Design a protein around this ligand. Structure first.
Ligand SMILES: O=C1NC(=O)[C@]2(CO[C@H](c3cccc(Br)c3)OC2)S1
Length: 133
């Protein structure tokens, strides 16, 4: 019953400062412009200890499966090759990505009927709000 309130199909309904977050990450112009248009569906499921998060979008489809606390390889939508670790901290899913001596953290939490995603790189935060699809 780990992560029950996250499970389901979610649609992006608002974004703030995502271009600035991508700039801070190092994303190039053309990827920022095209990726910034996308309104992905995020599909979250749990089977035993394995959590799967899929992102279906007109930009790029991605999928990760993981066990909490156990590092894994991830290729991000912008084609970074990162080492990721995802934990639960007080009911918030905390996803840290490490690559090229850099780090970014993505937090996902349930707030009312929304799933709120906060993406932080250095001093820049982007907030991405999802509703049930
Ligand atoms: O709502 C979101 N939920 C996530 O986990 C995000 C998935 O996309 C990445 C991303 C970073 C840089 C460039 C591109 Br293209 C994508 O940012 C995090 S956005």
């Amino acid at each position: 019953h780990m992560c029950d309130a996250f499970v389901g199909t979610w649609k992006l309904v608002s974004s703030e400062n995502f271009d600035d977050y991508m700039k801070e990450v190092g994303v190039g112009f053309a990827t920022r412009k095209v990726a910034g248009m996308a309104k992905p569906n995020m599909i979250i499921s749990v089977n035993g200890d394995v959590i799967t998060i899929k992102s279906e979008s007109t930009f790029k489809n991605t999928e990760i499966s993981f066990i909490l606390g156990q590092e894994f390889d991830e290729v991000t939508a912008d084609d970074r090759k990162v080492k990721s670790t995802i934990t639960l901290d007080g009911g918030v899913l905390v996803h840290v990505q490490k690559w090229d001596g850099k780090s970014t953290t993505i937090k996902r939490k349930r707030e009312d009927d929304k799933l709120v995603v906060e993406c932080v790189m250095k001093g820049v935060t982007s907030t991405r709000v999802y509703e049930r699809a």
